[PDB]
Ligand binder design. Structure first.
Ligand SMILES: [Mg+2]
Ligand SMILES: [Mg+2]
Ligand SMILES: [Mg+2]
Ligand SMILES: [Mg+2]
Ligand SMILES: [Mg+2]
Ligand SMILES: [Mg+2]
Ligand SMILES: [Mg+2]
Ligand SMILES: [Mg+2]
Ligand SMILES: [Mg+2]
Ligand SMILES: [Mg+2]
Ligand SMILES: [Mg+2]
Ligand SMILES: [Mg+2]
Ligand SMILES: [Mg+2]
Ligand SMILES: [Mg+2]
Ligand SMILES: [Mg+2]
Ligand SMILES: [Mg+2]
Ligand SMILES: [Mg+2]
Ligand SMILES: [Mg+2]
Ligand SMILES: [Mg+2]
Ligand SMILES: [Mg+2]
Ligand SMILES: [Mg+2]
Ligand SMILES: [Mg+2]
Ligand SMILES: [Mg+2]
Ligand SMILES: [Mg+2]
Ligand SMILES: [Mg+2]
Ligand SMILES: [Mg+2]
Ligand SMILES: [Mg+2]
Ligand SMILES: [Mg+2]
Ligand SMILES: [Mg+2]
Ligand SMILES: [Mg+2]
Ligand SMILES: [Mg+2]
Ligand SMILES: [Mg+2]
Ligand SMILES: [Mg+2]
Ligand SMILES: [Mg+2]
Ligand SMILES: [Mg+2]
Ligand SMILES: [Mg+2]
Ligand SMILES: [Mg+2]
Ligand SMILES: [Mg+2]
Ligand SMILES: [Mg+2]
Ligand SMILES: [Mg+2]
Ligand SMILES: [Mg+2]
Ligand SMILES: [Mg+2]
Ligand SMILES: [Mg+2]
Ligand SMILES: [Mg+2]
Ligand SMILES: [Mg+2]
Ligand SMILES: [Mg+2]
Ligand SMILES: [Mg+2]
Ligand SMILES: [Mg+2]
Ligand SMILES: [Mg+2]
Ligand SMILES: [Mg+2]
Ligand SMILES: [Mg+2]
Ligand SMILES: [Mg+2]
Ligand SMILES: [Mg+2]
Ligand SMILES: [Mg+2]
Ligand SMILES: [Mg+2]
Ligand SMILES: [Mg+2]
Ligand SMILES: [Mg+2]
Ligand SMILES: [Mg+2]
Ligand SMILES: [Mg+2]
Ligand SMILES: [Mg+2]
Ligand SMILES: [Mg+2]
Ligand SMILES: [Mg+2]
Ligand SMILES: [Mg+2]
Ligand SMILES: [Mg+2]
Ligand SMILES: [Mg+2]
Ligand SMILES: [Mg+2]
Ligand SMILES: [Mg+2]
Ligand SMILES: [Mg+2]
Ligand SMILES: [Mg+2]
Ligand SMILES: [Mg+2]
Ligand SMILES: [Mg+2]
Ligand SMILES: [Mg+2]
Ligand SMILES: [Mg+2]
Ligand SMILES: [Mg+2]
Ligand SMILES: [Mg+2]
Ligand SMILES: [Mg+2]
Ligand SMILES: [Mg+2]
Ligand SMILES: [Mg+2]
Ligand SMILES: [Mg+2]
Ligand SMILES: [Mg+2]
Ligand SMILES: [Mg+2]
Ligand SMILES: [Mg+2]
Ligand SMILES: [Mg+2]
Ligand SMILES: [Mg+2]
Ligand SMILES: [Mg+2]
Ligand SMILES: [Mg+2]
Lengths: 144, 205
RNA sequence: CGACUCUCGGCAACGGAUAUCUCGGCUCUCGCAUCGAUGAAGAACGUAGCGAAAUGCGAUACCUGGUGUGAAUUGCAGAA
RNA sequence: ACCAAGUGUUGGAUUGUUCACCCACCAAUAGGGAACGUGAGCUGGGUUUAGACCGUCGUGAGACAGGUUAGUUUUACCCU
RNA sequence: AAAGCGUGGCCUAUCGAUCCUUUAGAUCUUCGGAGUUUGAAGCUAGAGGUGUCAGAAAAGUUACCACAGGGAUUACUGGC
RNA sequence: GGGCGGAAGACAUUGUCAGGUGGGGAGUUUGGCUGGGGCGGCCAAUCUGUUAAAAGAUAACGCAGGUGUCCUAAGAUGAGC
RNA sequence: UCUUAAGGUAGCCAAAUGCCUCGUCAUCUAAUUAGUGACGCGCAUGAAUGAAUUAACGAGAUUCCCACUGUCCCUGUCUACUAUCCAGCGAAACCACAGCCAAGGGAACGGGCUUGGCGGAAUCAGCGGGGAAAGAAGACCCUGUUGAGCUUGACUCUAGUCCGACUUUGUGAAAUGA
RNA sequence: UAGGAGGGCGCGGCGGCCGAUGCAAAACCCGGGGCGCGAGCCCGGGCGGAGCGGCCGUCGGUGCAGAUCUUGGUGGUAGUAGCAAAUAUUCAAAUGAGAACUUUGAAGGCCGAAGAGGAGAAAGGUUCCAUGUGAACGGCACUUGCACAUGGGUAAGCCGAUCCUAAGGGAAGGGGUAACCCCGGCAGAUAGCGCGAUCACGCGCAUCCCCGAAAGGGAAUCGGGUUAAGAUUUCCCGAGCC
RNA sequence: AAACUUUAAAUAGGUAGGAUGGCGCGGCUGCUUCGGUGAGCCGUGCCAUGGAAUCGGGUGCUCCAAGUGGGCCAUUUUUGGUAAGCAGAACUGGCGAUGCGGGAUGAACCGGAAGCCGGGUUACGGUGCCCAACUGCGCGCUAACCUAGAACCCACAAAGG
RNA sequence: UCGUUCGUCUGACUUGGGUAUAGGGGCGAAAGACUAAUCGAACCAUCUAGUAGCUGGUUCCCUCCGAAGUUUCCCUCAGGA
RNA sequence: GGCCGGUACCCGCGCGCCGAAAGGCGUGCCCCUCGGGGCACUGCGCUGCAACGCCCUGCGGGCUCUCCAUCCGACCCGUCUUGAAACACGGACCAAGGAGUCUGACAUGCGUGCGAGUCGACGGGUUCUGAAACCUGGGAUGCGCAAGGAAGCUGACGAGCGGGAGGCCCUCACGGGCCGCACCGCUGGCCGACCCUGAUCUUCUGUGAAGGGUUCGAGUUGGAGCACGCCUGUCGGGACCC
RNA sequence: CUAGUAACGGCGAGCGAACCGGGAGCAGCCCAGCUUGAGAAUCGGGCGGCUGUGCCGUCCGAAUUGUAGUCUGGAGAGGCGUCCUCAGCGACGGACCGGGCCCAAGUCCCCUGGAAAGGGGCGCCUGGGAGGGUGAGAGCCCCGUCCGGCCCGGACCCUGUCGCCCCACGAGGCGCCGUCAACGAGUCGGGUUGUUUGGGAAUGCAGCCCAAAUCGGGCGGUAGACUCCGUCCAAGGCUAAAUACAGGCGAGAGACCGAUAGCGAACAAGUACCGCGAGGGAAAGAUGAAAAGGACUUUGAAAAGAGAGUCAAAGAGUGCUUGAAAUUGCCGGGAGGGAAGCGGAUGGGGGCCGGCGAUGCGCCCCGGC
């Protein structure tokens, strides 16, 4: 929107806002990230520490799919239960949630669970996640 | 370069303005493809406009092996088990894939049932006017025949979400899910050292 | 009162701004696939009652023929 | 030493020279300034591009506040 | 004997990033089909050095010279 | 006599790699500060005193000097002197 | 006597080569930083980097002498063509605004400012004091992480050339070798 | 000041709204009247002769005094600098609107023949010749012209070119080359075969094709006439030659 | 006696002047002690006339970003230099960036800082003319035959008569 | 370019036409001379709107707020963070 | 004596009489004791100061317009600079053109929509002025929803305190008490790299009751994000223009 | 989309893919080799004929150093077997392609005007109010536009139906069998060199050297040896569609430019003109509705002038719509002693301003509305 650009308010002002002494010159500091270790060293060290150097080890031909493990916490397992089936239950009778049908591979343990037992059926799980599920009275099932 | 910003990394140092691709012909592309589809539909009428039948396959790569999609074509065993000869299938609307394999029985069974399901609802006109050879159909059938459009055999991508209710039994509560994973990971990494200690047993002992 | 210089106004010059246009340009989109030894693209010279250029044409030379249309071409003259 | 800048302060050998120094006359051959007065006033000897020689220096290209020789000096008609 | 003192030199100077190489440490991690097993690649901590010492890999000449600038800066008058 | 006539002859030569030489030629470089620049120096890392104006900071190619080391003891501690 | 690879030999000289330097002596002059002849502790001469000579020659550099003369003392006069005036024709450079001075202050040499001097229409021909006059983004000097020509003991390369193996490349004989 | 922000003014489109205009739109002109701190705006008068404006939203190649800015136009300079080499013109008459500059006659001079004379090669291209002519052009002028317009004009067995080779160039097979291209002696059934023959066969084939000189080499012409303009030798007359 | 010092200022430097204070009671500790011995903390309950003068809403908190990184001048302290309208420092202010009144004239000297106006009064500086305002009222000194002399900075004059 | 004055003029002489050598190349009795008014590397087009820490310019109004020439690091000192 | 102002309240006026109008006129208490003085109860309404002039289509009135005169002030702009009127550069004049833009990435701020989600941006369907509009997919496309490790891997077991806007209860109220958002400060728990620790169980190398740490994280104990739009800023691009 | 990611990189500046997944579009084929041997069954050419893009006859020739047929790893040759499957031309069309024609309604009344296409009145068409022309803003004046109608000519090798012809002992499918089972060589592959890549003990490619195999070969993104595992079969060839498209030809559009803009060129523009050449490269649109483009008279050598004539208008007069500024002439006015202009004051002249400046409101008395 050219009508709100501020250069339209500096018309009639000689320098267009860039100063009389230090002008608007072409590339007075160099182009791009020139001088990251010479004359932009303070800026690179201050705002981007860790920028220079080589850490760790290479992984020729990395495929992301090999590393895919979506995760869900136990605090979110009861939104997964439909209400009518959340009603059908006894003290020993609990719903079973295949988190694999919701796109999750591992179950993590953040958050609280209600007293109602649950049977989480997952590919992977953490220590605490099963410790919290058992403490609610439910069980864990491993699948593939 | 100046104030706390992200490190700039734009790849604009070549003669990029000579390879700018704009999309002003996108609405015209849709129309040409629509006319192409429409013109194709008439020249294949009454054959279905989606194309030949595609089998169910599981996708590759961990991330997707839980999802089913359409594959290129039926294997030779799937074709022969359903009793559709190798060189007749493309002529009646069924694609073939001489390269795909059947490593797991369930996949083979699923795609066999599709061929019978397709064969059940398939109708074939005679090659001439009055002669009815093998595989042809009744005149009543050939008048009720229209050009079906869309996906006449849909593929469900994966398992429907079901949250059943069961009773949590004492064995279920005793099972250590985390303990099972760690001991099974343990066995995997000791596989060589165990086999080596075993292997050297028969070498020396 | 005058001459000269400067200046204000009216009129008249000089010049081609402005306005109003536009058989041109620019941009986007679509369809199609057609040069040549059977001599192409390009170059040259000719060619009209009155023509230099452009346009057209080739000693059949601003055209011959067929077909469609249906009474003009036009700057002047003439067969009509 | 005073008042006093009214008048005057030259001809030549050698040197591009300012400076100098001799010859000679003279009453005297005082000292200075004016964008170190004065190049759209001259001249171009020197210095101060490009050619070239010598000496010293430098491995060399070349250097020389060393010596040498040859090397373009434009315009007024405006205002004062 | 002990309280204590001792993390170099009585105190104030005496020293060095990334990348690379090299060493030490774990009965460590990886080489992505699984293993054995050389080799390689990592993790932590040192050394090999940047003295222009917050750290480019670097000889002249130009009088045959060029360009962007500088009165932020010399060579002449003027000024203190 | 199925040798045109001679000379060399599996060495020359060719092709591909390897080492050496190579301003003949290509590309490039040839710090900074600086009472102009150059030459000199280092006031570029760096310590003590002073300048420094009794807190701290404080300049100059300011002043008088120093540094790139040395030490199994010249490190530690105890005792005696 | 120290030293060197050798210690500048024959010659030549204040030379187009000598700083000092206008060297010292003589000659030329009335008077010579000039010239020529000598002298040689030669800043910094010297032998094909050629040394020393040298008749003839030279639009080559330099000194002197006779003749000649407006080069000069010292200017005057004459001719032609201009300039000048007229008819006709008719540009360009340059141009912030302009256009009289003295002193002061001021970016430290004003046309304008301050304070004084002054100052009267309109015109013609000249002149070179000023306009720090015109011409040209100083060629000297510096700066720039701008160049280029040339050089080399700069860094990095490279054509060429030399050298070896393999290939082309077959045949068979001996001697030391394994 | 450098710099930042807000609120406005102005220009041109697009979506909407509200309107003016042949009873005179836009643009432009004015010593016309006003409004606003200002950017700007409103009206009057004139000129013109067919388009235009305000408001809301939105958009942009949107505001000039400079850049030795770009293009165009215009001044002062200024009726000024200037029209000065190659010795030189004068008198009558004709012509004509108009004569220093055209034409005829007379006189006075110059080039002085290594010419200011008579002819060509290159280069030009109609400038050649006649008739006519308003402007422009011929740095004054012109009745005039190398200008403008309309016509006309270049005649060859014998002059040339054309033929031959020079230095040199191009080139087929072959060699190189990624290919464009680069190599001619490298020697290949080298291009071409030539000659006698036809009524067919014979012989021979050697250093070999093409281009390259209007000054080199070379079949053959002379004299006299003729036009406004062609010819000395192209046309005519006569006489020859290859 | 800058690179000597016993002594030792003026100016400038630091801290404090309550509600973020104090006490009693009963608890915690893996720290400390011979030890409830302490150190600290926790919970409760009470008190605390606001604890010098003056002045006053806060960068208090956070974000995004521009320009600048040639300075120069004056009084004072101060280094090199014979000195300089020279070079380099310390504190403050000014100019730069700012007009206005005065110093004739001037970037930083004196006064003073600002919307457009009416009236009044001042600051620095002045009151013979130029030039608004007295040739005002007083007292002395000076007589220049050198241009007497006459404006903070400031546009000099010294030793000596 | 012009005037006067000069150098050479049987020779390493003057000259026309033809032909050969083309740009890091030619050609040079050598001056970095000449190669179409262009030469210490011609000319033409393109890459190319090459890069510039350097010079010049940078277009309407009002109102409000309002600086810095100092620190540290940088082949850094006319620049930048 | 000068400047401003002219009253909607402050003053002032009517409500009773006298008086042209100033102004006066009543009663009672206190005071001196002349003059007279001081206080008193107070109510309803109302509420822009005047008097005369001058001119009235005129030779009048005023004017922001034009010219001229006079007094005071007053150097030429743009630019770089500590400093420009400069003997610093550019500018003879006029008209027209003429320079921070477009795009990609990111960031803060602001607006809009939805919200643990959010995007329909490649396609498909449909659409008769529309290359528009409208529908559809996504059960996992991007970003977010979880992090620490070089990696193998493991992956948040549920927070107290001080100050706090605001609400509520109590008091005649000043004061008190209760709960306390955001934000600031303080101390912790948990996840992970590293270290340390080890009951029990177990597939003998795994698990992990308990117990940890002057260590490290862009962590958690607050789900706030995603899409679009605009200014500004950094960067790449011809990149404000030459 | 992965993804500014893995990687590559004085690990600096920077650079940078692929797999998976989602869409568009989908289609697979044919050779060589052991396999005619009672038999080259194949192919070209001349000539002749006919139904003529070909088929037939015949004569020459190619080819056995190999034409045809089989066969291509998914296989295949064989053997057996109930079985199951196969030939073409007519006739009319539908679609797509080009072309020519035909198609609604006012020019009714008044005014202004040169001109009515403008205003007012009265009407009409509209599946047609896109656009253009015609003397000023026209739905109805003209061409067109909407709905469609018609007539002519193509290419087509796509399918829609009626007609006759009836596919086979050949081949193919399918059921079993196990005997066979042939599969591309200076090539692969390895070394080394150079280049290239994101490809890192080497991604592709190329030179040279070495140089294969047939329980064998190529891969599984870190060089190496062994055991296993997944995977594919190079060294011969063809193959639509989805994609690209500053040229060519034919269209349709636009929040674009409006004659210094837009292409260099709106115009006899790649023109004039320049350069030996390669090359460089402009300027320049607008009378009027209609030429009605100014007869004639008079002065002049002429160009022209003055009268006149045309026109709504020429003062719109052949570079002619409008017609700014700089700069210039004439007429009128004003001022001036080495600048002028400028800011504040006011005085004199001008020039201009009547919304420049009022004559109305309340009581009243009639005399009518
Ligand atoms: Mg500003
Ligand atoms: Mg800015
Ligand atoms: Mg600027
Ligand atoms: Mg800057
Ligand atoms: Mg600066
Ligand atoms: Mg900057
Ligand atoms: Mg550095
Ligand atoms: Mg002079
Ligand atoms: Mg000289
Ligand atoms: Mg010289
Ligand atoms: Mg010299
Ligand atoms: Mg003169
Ligand atoms: Mg010690
Ligand atoms: Mg180190
Ligand atoms: Mg692997
Ligand atoms: Mg440093
Ligand atoms: Mg160099
Ligand atoms: Mg030199
Ligand atoms: Mg070199
Ligand atoms: Mg330097
Ligand atoms: Mg110096
Ligand atoms: Mg102090
Ligand atoms: Mg101190
Ligand atoms: Mg000797
Ligand atoms: Mg000597
Ligand atoms: Mg003499
Ligand atoms: Mg001598
Ligand atoms: Mg010597
Ligand atoms: Mg020598
Ligand atoms: Mg000579
Ligand atoms: Mg004259
Ligand atoms: Mg003066
Ligand atoms: Mg001046
Ligand atoms: Mg005068
Ligand atoms: Mg004069
Ligand atoms: Mg002069
Ligand atoms: Mg000048
Ligand atoms: Mg310069
Ligand atoms: Mg630098
Ligand atoms: Mg260079
Ligand atoms: Mg070297
Ligand atoms: Mg536009
Ligand atoms: Mg613009
Ligand atoms: Mg302008
Ligand atoms: Mg400006
Ligand atoms: Mg004259
Ligand atoms: Mg002359
Ligand atoms: Mg002769
Ligand atoms: Mg003639
Ligand atoms: Mg003439
Ligand atoms: Mg020839
Ligand atoms: Mg000849
Ligand atoms: Mg001849
Ligand atoms: Mg004859
Ligand atoms: Mg104190
Ligand atoms: Mg900065
Ligand atoms: Mg400044
Ligand atoms: Mg006042
Ligand atoms: Mg002669
Ligand atoms: Mg010759
Ligand atoms: Mg020649
Ligand atoms: Mg030279
Ligand atoms: Mg640019
Ligand atoms: Mg500068
Ligand atoms: Mg300066
Ligand atoms: Mg000056
Ligand atoms: Mg300059
Ligand atoms: Mg100028
Ligand atoms: Mg403009
Ligand atoms: Mg999602
Ligand atoms: Mg940019
Ligand atoms: Mg991403
Ligand atoms: Mg690349
Ligand atoms: Mg009609
Ligand atoms: Mg009508
Ligand atoms: Mg119309
Ligand atoms: Mg019609
Ligand atoms: Mg490679
Ligand atoms: Mg292919
Ligand atoms: Mg144009
Ligand atoms: Mg053009
Ligand atoms: Mg008119
Ligand atoms: Mg007109
Ligand atoms: Mg018109
Ligand atoms: Mg006109
Ligand atoms: Mg004018």
């Amino acid at each position: 929107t050219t009508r709100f650009k501020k250069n339209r308010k500096k018309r009639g002002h000689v320098s267009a806002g860039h100063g009389r002494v230090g002008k608007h010159r072409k590339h007075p500091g160099g182009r791009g990230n020139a001088g990251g270790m010479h004359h932009h060293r303070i800026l690179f060290d201050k705002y981007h520490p860790g920028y220079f150097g080589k850490v760790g080890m290479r992984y020729f031909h990395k495929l992301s799919n090999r590393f895919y493990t979506p995760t869900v916490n136990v605090e979110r397992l009861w939104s997964m239960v439909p209400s009518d089936k959340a009603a059908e239950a006894g003290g020993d009778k609990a719903p079973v949630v295949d988190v694999s049908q919701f796109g999750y591979f591992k179950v993590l343990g953040k958050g609280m669970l209600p007293e109602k037992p649950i049977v989480v059926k997952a590919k992977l799980i953490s220590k605490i996640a099963e410790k919290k599920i058992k403490a609610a009275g439910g069980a864990v099932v491993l699948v593939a | 370069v100046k104030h706390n910003n992200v490190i700039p990394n734009g790849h604009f140092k070549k003669h990029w303005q000579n390879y700018v691709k704009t999309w002003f012909n996108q609405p015209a592309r849709k129309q040409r493809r629509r006319i192409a589809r429409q013109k194709k539909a008439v020249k294949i009428f009454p054959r279905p406009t989606s194309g030949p039948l595609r089998p169910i396959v599981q996708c590759q790569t961990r991330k997707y092996n839980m999802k089913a999609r359409a594959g290129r074509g039926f294997t030779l065993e799937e074709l022969k088990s359903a009793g559709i000869p190798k060189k007749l299938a493309p002529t009646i609307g069924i694609s073939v894939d001489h390269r795909r394999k059947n490593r797991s029985l369930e996949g083979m069974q699923s795609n066999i049932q599709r061929l019978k399901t397709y064969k059940a609802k398939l109708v074939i006109f005679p090659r001439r006017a009055r002669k009815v050879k093998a595989g042809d159909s009744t005149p009543e059938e050939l008048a009720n025949a229209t050009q079906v459009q869309g996906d006449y055999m849909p593929i469900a991508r994966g398992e429907k979400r079901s949250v059943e209710v069961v009773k949590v039994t004492e064995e279920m509560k005793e099972f250590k899910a985390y303990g099972k994973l760690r001991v099974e990971r343990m066995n995997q990494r000791q596989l060589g050292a165990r086999q080596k200690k075993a292997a050297e047993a028969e070498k020396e002992e």
